[PDB]
Design a protein around this ligand. Structure first.
Ligand SMILES: CCSCc1nnc2c(C(=O)Nc3nnc(C)o3)ccc(C(F)(F)F)n12
Ligand SMILES: CCSCc1nnc2c(C(=O)Nc3nnc(C)o3)ccc(C(F)(F)F)n12
Ligand SMILES: [Co+2]
Ligand SMILES: [Co+2]
Lengths: 380, 380
């Protein structure tokens, strides 16, 4: 059941922020690979002497890419006089994050009714503060607490266009790419120990348990907001083969964000667009499951997807899972950067109409075993 | 004249190495933006636990992109047992370079007849050593000396496929992009003081002076090898407006590589391909000169380019210059990464046939004044 125990009012996922070495090159690659439009900037051309920040959007999904300039450019600034548009930014914190983890998510940002209250209530309830509430242009409020490793949960609230200090991009370079991605479905963390992480985060949010999974690799559990639109799964390693969660922890130098699942309104169109671009600057995908996996498909989702929809899953390497309430189409990219750490999931859910309920169809845990068997079935 | 005073045998430009935060994302962006094929790799999948290195090629042009892994992955290695394919690499040097300069060229690499001799002769003649000669798999030899700032000149020689330890990419991800770029024409450095830099480099190479320029921004001079195929211009600031060389030095935190000029066998095809991709992950170009610039074109190169070739220059924003021996088509990108530092020039030269002689048509110094006047002519 859903106890609806949120200690403050959470509205939805707002944005994800990557900390980069060069924000330009990462953002250009992600834009082309995922079909996200360049929609706002904050950099030297807008008067920001501290950091370069570029925002990509597709539907409601917002990806922010931030890198530091030379500290010499802002050596005369103090926090009261800063040109930074994100006043929680720090040159040394950013360099230390990137040197330790490589390219990765620094901030999981959620929109709340009041960011200052959500911060106070969180820290009162055990959250480790990262950046106190700061009010931008008397219009937006931002605050940050630690989530896991060097990832922060960022609260944002509005009185009433991304952030103050960001300039809209609607010019020539704002080409309207769109491969169908529409919003962030869930954001998954890897930690060394699940219990303490779950206890910590659920303690300061009031998020309730949504699901759990406990025999190849990991144990996980999901925290959700009251309407279960904000979904934060957390994984730990399970010590034949070496845990992929452990591989993550070793190459990331500890806990951090493992994958972002992005909802598509038409996953077949998204995967056709993304796959056409894999070899020309885009993203590569994990190897497709054997044909045996797609033979077992008609017997499990033949009532949900036509033979034509099923055959299109096989062309594209799409995975399908199903619980008692919904059906799930999913697929995974290879890692986004140099290290075998963060990757992206594309998903589309069918069912649970009331709008669609969060988590409709689960998270594809059934595909672990469905993949292990269909692999052994094709070796024959 | 050309004294042909090379203190060792230089053959040609071999490659350019970028030091990055994430080599994957920079290399994917450059590949798509410039039309360069992914042709070799050295990373975790090849057994390199130290650095990720990806090589792009177009014609004879080779761009190498390298980033460090976590040092923990190779904590048990020593230089005699290293898994690095480029043994001059150092984690701390790479992080310090990138944190200080952002994305930029670390190595200008030239092919010589014998890299060990070229290193010895260079250091004997005043070169500051960076990495002593190392022989890779008894097949290739590599050595490095300081060029300017934190840029090194890298010598490479072969007894007889890029480097030992690199695996060829000819698979699916090796899509054969090609927009016409064929080789590196020249590589330009910015320093605070031209004289000492010129004296230093010409001292240890024997490269001779090829050209010079001394009233908007800079003074420069060109060093060339005996056949004038290796061309290394160096700029210094000239202290109405602020020197763009000084802007470079401030945002780069000192001297470094300013621009790479890449020869195209068909600059009109290259610029059409690159411009179609500017807004979808590729490179942006500097703003085009006014129509007045292209009206003055028929009167200066009307004997070299048809009215149709001239009008195509205007569509594409291409600049044209001409000395007593050749004609030059050129254009400049905006900076390649976050900072207003490094950028790329595309060029194509017409004339000086004997093969074509290096530097045929000069370097476009006439376009500075030709641009200043044609701008004032269009304000009218
Ligand atoms: C490149 C790694 S591929 C292996 C792999 N990695 N993650 C997954 C997931 C997944 O997202 N689980 C999840 N998300 N939130 C919760 C809670 O649980 C489903 C299926 C597979 C697969 F094994 F079927 F591919 N995965
Ligand atoms: C984004 C900056 S645009 C301004 C600009 N920056 N560099 C140039 C060059 C140039 O490459 N000179 C050179 N190369 N080797 C030597 C020696 O000399 C020619 C023309 C112009 C221009 F002013 F005409 F554009 N430039
Ligand atoms: Co998932
Ligand atoms: Co040039």
């Amino acid at each position: 059941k859903n106890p609806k125990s949120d200690k403050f009012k959470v509205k939805r996922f707002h944005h994800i922020e990557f900390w980069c070495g060069d924000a330009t090159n990462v953002a250009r690659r992600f834009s082309w690979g995922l079909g996200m439009r360049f929609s706002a900037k904050s950099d030297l051309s807008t008067g920001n002497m501290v950091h370069a920040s570029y925002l990509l959007t597709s539907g409601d999904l917002r990806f922010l890419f931030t890198a530091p300039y030379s500290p010499s450019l802002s050596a005369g600034e103090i926090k009261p006089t800063t040109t930074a548009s994100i006043p929680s930014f720090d040159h040394g914190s950013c360099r230390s994050f990137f040197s330790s983890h490589g390219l990765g998510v620094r901030a999981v940002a959620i929109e709340v009714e009041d960011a200052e209250s959500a911060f106070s209530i969180s820290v009162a309830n055990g959250a480790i503060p990262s950046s106190p509430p700061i009010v931008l242009n008397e219009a937006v409020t931002i605050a940050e607490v630690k989530l896991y490793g060097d990832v922060v949960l960022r609260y944002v609230s509005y009185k009433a266009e991304f952030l103050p200090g960001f300039e809209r991009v609607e010019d020539a370079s704002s080409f309207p790419l769109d491969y169908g991605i529409r919003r962030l479905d869930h954001a998954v963390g890897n930690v060394p120990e699940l219990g303490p992480a779950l206890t910590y985060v659920a303690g300061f949010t009031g998020f309730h348990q949504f699901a759990e999974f406990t025999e190849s690799g990991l144990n996980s559990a999901v925290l959700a907001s009251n309407d279960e639109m904000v979904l934060l799964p957390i994984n730990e390693p399970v010590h034949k083969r070496k845990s992929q969660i452990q591989t993550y922890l070793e190459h990331n130098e500890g806990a951090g964000l493992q994958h972002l699942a992005l909802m598509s309104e038409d996953i077949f169109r998204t995967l056709r667009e993304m796959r056409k671009r894999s070899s020309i600057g885009g993203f590569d995908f994990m190897p497709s499951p054997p044909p045996t996996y797609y033979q077992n498909l008609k017997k499990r989702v033949g009532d949900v997807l036509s033979d034509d929809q099923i055959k299109e899953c096989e062309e594209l390497g799409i995975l399908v899972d199903r619980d008692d309430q919904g059906t799930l189409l999913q697929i995974f990219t290879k890692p986004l950067g140099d290290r075998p750490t963060i990757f992206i999931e594309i998903i589309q859910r069918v069912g649970c109409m009331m709008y669609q309920s969060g988590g409709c169809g689960g998270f594809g845990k059934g595909n672990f075993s469905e993949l292990f068997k269909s692999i052994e079935e094709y070796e024959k």
